[PDB]
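Q: A reviewer asked whether we had any structural model of the full assembly, not just the individual parts. We don't, so I'm hoping you can provide one. Inputs are below.
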Amino acid sequence: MIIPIRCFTCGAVVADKWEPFSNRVMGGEDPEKVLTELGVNRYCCRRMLLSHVNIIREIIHYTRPI
Amino acid sequence: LRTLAQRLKGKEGRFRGNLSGKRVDFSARTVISPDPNLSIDEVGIPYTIARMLTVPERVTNINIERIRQYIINGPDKWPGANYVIKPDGRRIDLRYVKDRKELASSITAGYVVERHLVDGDVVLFNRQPSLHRISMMAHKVRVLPGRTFRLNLLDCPPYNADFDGDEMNLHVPQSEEAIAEARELMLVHKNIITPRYGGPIIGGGQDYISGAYLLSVKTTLLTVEEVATILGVTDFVGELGEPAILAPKPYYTGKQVISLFLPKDFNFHGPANISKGPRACKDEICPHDSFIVIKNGLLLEGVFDKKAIGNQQPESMLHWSIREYGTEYGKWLMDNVFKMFIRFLEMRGFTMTLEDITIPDEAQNEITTKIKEGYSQVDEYIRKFNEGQLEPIPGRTIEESLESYILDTLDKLRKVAGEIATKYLDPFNNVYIMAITGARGSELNITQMTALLGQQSVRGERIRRGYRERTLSLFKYGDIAPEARGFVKNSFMRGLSPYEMFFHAAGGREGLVDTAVKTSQSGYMQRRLINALSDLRIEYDGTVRSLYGDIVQVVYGDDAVHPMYSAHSKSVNVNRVIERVIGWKR
Amino acid sequence: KKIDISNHELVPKHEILQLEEAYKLVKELGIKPEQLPWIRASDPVAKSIGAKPGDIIKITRKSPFTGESVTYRYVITG
Amino acid sequence: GYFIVNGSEKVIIAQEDLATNRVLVDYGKSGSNITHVAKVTSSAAGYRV
Amino acid sequence: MIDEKLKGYIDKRLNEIKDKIPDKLHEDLRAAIMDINGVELTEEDIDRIIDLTIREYQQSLIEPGEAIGVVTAQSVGEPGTQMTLRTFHFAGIRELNVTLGLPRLIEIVDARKVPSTPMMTIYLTDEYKTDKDKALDIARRIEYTRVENVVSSVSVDISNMSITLQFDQEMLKDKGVSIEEIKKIITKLKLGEIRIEDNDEYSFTIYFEKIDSIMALFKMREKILNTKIKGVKGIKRAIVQKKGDEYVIITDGSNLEGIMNVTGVDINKIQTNNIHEVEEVLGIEAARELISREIKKVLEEQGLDVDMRHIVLVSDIMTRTGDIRQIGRHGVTGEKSSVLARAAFEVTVKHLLDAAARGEREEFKGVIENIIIGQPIRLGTGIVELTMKPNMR
Amino acid sequence: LEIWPSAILGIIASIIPYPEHNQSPRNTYQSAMAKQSLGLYASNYQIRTDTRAHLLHYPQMPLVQTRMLGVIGYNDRPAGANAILAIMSYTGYNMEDS
Amino acid sequence: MTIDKINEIFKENWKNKLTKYEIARIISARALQLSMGALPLIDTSNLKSDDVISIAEEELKRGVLPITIRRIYPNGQVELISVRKI
Amino acid sequence: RHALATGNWVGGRTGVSQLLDRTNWLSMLSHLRRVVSSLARGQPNFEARDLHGTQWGRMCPFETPEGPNSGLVKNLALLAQVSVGINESVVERVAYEL
Amino acid sequence: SIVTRHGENGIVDLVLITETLEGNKLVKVRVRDLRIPEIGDKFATRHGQKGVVGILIDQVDMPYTAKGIVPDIILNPHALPSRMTIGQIMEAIGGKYAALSGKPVDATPFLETPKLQEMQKEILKLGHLPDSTEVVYDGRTGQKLKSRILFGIVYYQKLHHMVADKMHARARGPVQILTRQPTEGRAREGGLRFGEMERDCLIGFGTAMLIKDRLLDNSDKAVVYICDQCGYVGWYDRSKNRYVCPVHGDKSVLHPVTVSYAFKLLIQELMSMVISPRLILGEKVNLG
Amino acid sequence: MSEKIIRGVKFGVLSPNEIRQMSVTAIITSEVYDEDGTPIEGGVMDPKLGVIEPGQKCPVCGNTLAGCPGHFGHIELIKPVIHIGYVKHIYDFLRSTCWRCGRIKIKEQDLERYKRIYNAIKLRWPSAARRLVEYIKKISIKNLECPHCGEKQFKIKLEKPYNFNEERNGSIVKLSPSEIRDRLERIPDSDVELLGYDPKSSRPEWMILTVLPVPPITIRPSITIESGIRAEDDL
Amino acid sequence: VTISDIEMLLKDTEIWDKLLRNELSIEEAKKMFDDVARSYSKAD
Amino acid sequence: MSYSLKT
Ligand SMILES: [Mg+2]
Ligand SMILES: [Zn+2]
Ligand SMILES: [Zn+2]
Ligand SMILES: [Zn+2]
Ligand SMILES: [Zn+2]
Ligand SMILES: [Zn+2]
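A: Here is a predicted structure for the entire assembly that you could use as a starting point for your response.
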């Protein structure tokens, strides 16, 4: 739904690196260079960042009326 | 409406719903999960079930302090108790007791306490459909954190259970006589040998065989620390002895570590499961470890594989060891030596890489040439068939000999391709090790992965159902070439073409269907046979008689020998006795 | 059909038991004579040896466990 | 592609069956006085014969 | 190999235990000791071997009170769930489809009068044993060829009131039958006042001048087309095969007496797939042995291991009453002697109504009824009677 | 001429990666089990009332994709996660399908 | 050899042995007896377990139980076998 | 309405209307493309469950249930299209004038 | 009143109140609960590799590699050679390449891009071994394993067969009104069926008292009084004191017998028809 | 008095007099309850038959559900009716005996020899006895005259399910249960046991219903499920 | 035919029962056995 | 508990 705070395999914080990576890739930059220069080197954290879906931007429209 | 006749009918009426079978209490059903740290006659149960199912123990003058301690702990503390039954017959619920600390001191001999399940309690553990008698066995309770029933990996074959999501049932006997009978007749370790034939049903599985082979091989050398780590999982403590190799560096060996557990008068000479290929040396002078030689409890050469410790392998060294040192030594051995196999397997590395299936490009060229030769032969057969020129096999007509010729040459092509693929592969890789040791896989699976799959067939014949005179619309009218009828010349590693995928699915669809029919027919036949042979008994004079008096056999079998106590359907193996006596000097 | 079938390889050896032997067998087994397995008097092998109702037929069969095994049958009318 | 009936979502599963207004021929059962059989299943506007 | 003094010691020590082991075991033990070569052996080893053999045999005996019937039923019915349809034809024929596995086991157990796909294995006499041409001739002599499968086309002419028959030469050539023989066979049918006139090399015509009816002419045509020309009834096709150094015939039909009547057939070695046929022809003991062999062959082919004692026991119980009986509705209810167990086997009230009408009585001798009402069974621990002396502490 | 040779498969068999390197029964088993996985089933799941519902907290789209995963919209309603898989024998707790 | 040699061997073997069913029945009866009254015939202080089943097994093993088994043959012959060593 | 909420259709058909399987996206997508054989479970016949060569491009060769319904419940292929039909009169007239 | 189902709890998630087109008040309450993976949960892949969790291992005890990466799931090699799923290993390699490179991977059948050789070369170029194997150390002892272990990024799915919804145990509770036998259903406090085949196993083991305990003492046990002459069931009233017979009145002696209550029901419903079953009694104690 | 065990079960056909004497009440009225008054006298829910709700005492016996076995009622049928489960048996009782004198239509001396053989072999060889009785029935059915009374007997054909239509030189006559019972009442005991039946426990005219037994409520309890009106069962 | 067989079976059972009670010795039992056999073999 | 007493 939203980016996990930490990588699942190793406890590395990865949530703070989502909004840069999600932007510069949309700007035409290849993901590998951005990931390397952001400080992500183990492929577990690369898996965490590369396969996020971010559904919450659609669920904010359909929220419990409580 | 449902009337008196309908009130007693079907599988939900009175006879099959409330008389032959019925719902009972003091039972549970739960998913099962593996646990290699339990004994072969133990079952792990969760805390919730242990605190719900209770066993009534009568208070005597011998076990009164323990029962008092049980009463002191409430229903919510384990171990504890749920109810206390006064000698008058009235029940007291410990949930509403104002102060059970004084009630514990108030009890005397004659009271009954319904305590929680504790370690060592005997329960009945079952897995449906319960085909045979050892599908329901007596196990000893061990309480562990979790939510599933825990079963040892060696206990699976009798239950025919694997951890794909299966559930099993547990029953708690509630009387002293029932508990005594279950403990004295239904214990797991007492039923290692199956009654169908003379051979162990509980034995080594798949990781155990690979670990045993890797530990027993000639080239294994262990240091003192490695030996201590391997032996830390067992109960063995004592003198290791001198290392097998003293200089330059002190090294033990796998056979020396294994030999610490064999009895000091055990002799065995026999081949191994790896002695089928080019390793067959047929005698003790073998450059390979393809012949097992044990003298006075010392393993001098040979490896352990499916033919030495595997389950359902009669006349193996495990079978003779059990037969000569009781289910007691059988259980001790299975509990102790079978864990070093796993420990050494995880001490070494056992994986499966894609490089164990790929063959060099020089092999693929030979496979292609063989395939082209076979296709040319089939084409020659077909071409000469269209103009007579065929001498049919005697007793067979034309158009029946052509199909036989085609099938024969395709099978020969498959065998040749498999041999070529096997020859050019690495003789020592994990897939080949699993295949030869009997852990998992077979030669056919290796052939299909590395070389061509072969000819797919439906009901024993080539795939023919489809359009008129052709299976698919991708082929010409009236084509009986090998490709057009379901011959797959590719491998799983190489990948299949679309029509080859279709032919493979068409060939394999029958397995998804036959299972339900087979199980239903088996159930019906077994029910009839049980109802026919239910009331037969063996008298004190050896005869087999029905409970109504009449005689079926003058003496059971022909020599009054139980199949369970026989040496693989044999009263006694005289060669085995001669070996047991004088095998240390052969 | 005059073909003799007593020499077929599926046919064990049948013999007619004497009255003394039958009496000893019945007393030692503690049974009534009709509690043994039955054989019809019209059976081809029983007819080949002239078996009559009320007799006891001793049958010797091949066996992989003891070589030869001996069983008994009671001749009933039919 | 579904319906909302009483709040629930219901779907009509496609049903595959033999063609109706056609003639199907076959051999008769072995050991019977009938050698060959033909069958037609005419479909009307409400009933099938 | 063995010293003569040692051999005398062997005989002396073996003659003292003749009454403690079966005779076959005594022969096997004696032969095994005589085959010990390359190793010197003393008298202590011999004593140990003999004592161990006797003790092992004694420890391998069965225990009175065993519920052997349920064990045998479970040992036979458990492999039935692991059967597979791995094969669809004979060993090396690729035709003559066979039924093995679970359906064949059910057919044997249900005691069907006629098996699905009956077969026969015919051995040849010593004179005809090693001749392929003779084996082929004998196989061809009994294939049961019919008129319908040697003609190309048949025509009916109501204008001439006649039927024209045209023969395919190739099939007529391989069947080994001439036109004159077929003409004689047709004349032997006694169809009425008829006449046959030749038309071609392999074609003739019958005129049926007696009959004047549009009906029954097609009936006569069909009767002619169904006429046998050679072979024995029941056999569909026979195939000559080589087993060892001899030639055998595998047959897709079953007719035991007809084959016994055929010249050149070894009557004392013929084996058939049909159990009722051999039961009626050879006897009940032959049927018992055939049932045992059939069950063993069915189980062995699938690769499943079952002890022979279970098979012998089920074969014995199946042929107890002097003839083969179905083990279920006719082998349970036949010797049930119980109403509740029979009424619980199949869920019906017909048996209860019959028992009430005939005023039958139940004795609760078996195990199912005792479990139903709630009494202990008389197997296992129910066979044991205990007596105690409480006064002696 | 065939428009798409891979279009002989269904809508669930089109999610298997490299389906031509597996045995035939495995793909049928995969279809049966993929009809049961947990994940997001609708965007407005919080306002609709279903008798039984499941929600995966952090679903991820597959790293190894197929051409039909994006067409059917599976990348927007994923039902799983990517796991670092090791292939080895360890402690005997993964024997026999576990 | 009354009827067969194998039957004589069988009866001779089982003349002085206890089948597992007899052992189970004896243990069950003794365990039921100890559960109510019936003070043990052994020293119940060195025993590892204080439950009735273990005491019954130990008493049977030591051979102190005054229990006899009657085996009634199909022809009416009866045989008395005693478990006390004495 | 009573026909849709129960599935008991006219002509003796049963189970035609079923509740939508909204476990996930793939469950709903597969449910909306299922095809059930009418003449089924009355006998195996060992031939209605075969993979006929005519199914190429029309039914998925993998997505089938396991058990009694194996080979009788199928799923549409990717590009398959069920025809809707026209009136026979115009075809008859054009055939006659041809 | 509507109550929460037995054996399951949660947190009230939503409450809705509306009208069903006729003025009737309709109330809906949705309750949620949290499910954390545990031993017994079922997982699967896209290649037919279902299985349950055998144990959960911490990060310290996992076999870390030379870069500190620990596996998320460990899969036994022995499951591969028999099932013959090469696509599993191919997907593992492809996923590792996709995570390393950041490039898209397409695995459509017959048209896979990139090929395996290109992916392996690129993996080697990015600092990892081409065969997707790694050097692994033991997390418990620190000893380097003698072999290399294959690592991948296979995609996994969680199925709705959770162990938290499959446990059910019964000690005692409600019984049927007719047969007086334990009820059926997890929500009805439970009850397990003891079929015929389990009874056959018990008979095969030859345990009479265990059979009696399983089938009689723990279900529908009852005591009934039988007349000594007609054989029908009498009773024992609380007027003052009497063993009374339905036909003999007070002129017969009645004996009590313990029996399954289902058998008594069978007798009663047999007398509903014209069948007359008379029970013949016998001595409990065997004289001699 | 001593505690006993069940040793055997003796079956049979329940006598109408025995049904009358085992019953406690006679069911006369036709309404199950009035203004929810299930204890209405003479109904199927009469409290004298049994009690099923927790708090109540049975009128017949001062016992609650714990110790109250069900009590049977009786209904006096005004027109005899035939048991559907027994029809085949009475079929064999119609084609194997004379309609007028009610005796087997086999002559005297061979019938006496047959019954002597049957009694001498009844218990030792039950299968042989069954064969003997089936042979006797077959040879008695195929006789069209009664030697005992010298009368010519017609034939009866069975029509499903329960109606027997006898042929009487044309104009097939439908048979009534009353005359069937009258015919079956005349068969002597010595001849009914020869056919494989028991006269003292299964008498053929008891096989024709004149009084019907009423099962207690404990066999047909009223279910109050769905939190609404109680739902009665089919019985 | 069938009735003669049943009488044969009954008489054989009676002779065996009498012999088992020691009412008559072996030789007269054998004479009765084969006398019954010959007497009832005429019908067969 | 039974007696089976007789005189
Ligand atoms: Mg499983
Ligand atoms: Zn990470
Ligand atoms: Zn070698
Ligand atoms: Zn009475
Ligand atoms: Zn009452
Ligand atoms: Zn008359």
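A: Points you may want to mention in the reply: Chain J is about 25% helix and 15% strand. The two ends of chain J are 38 Å apart (CA to CA).
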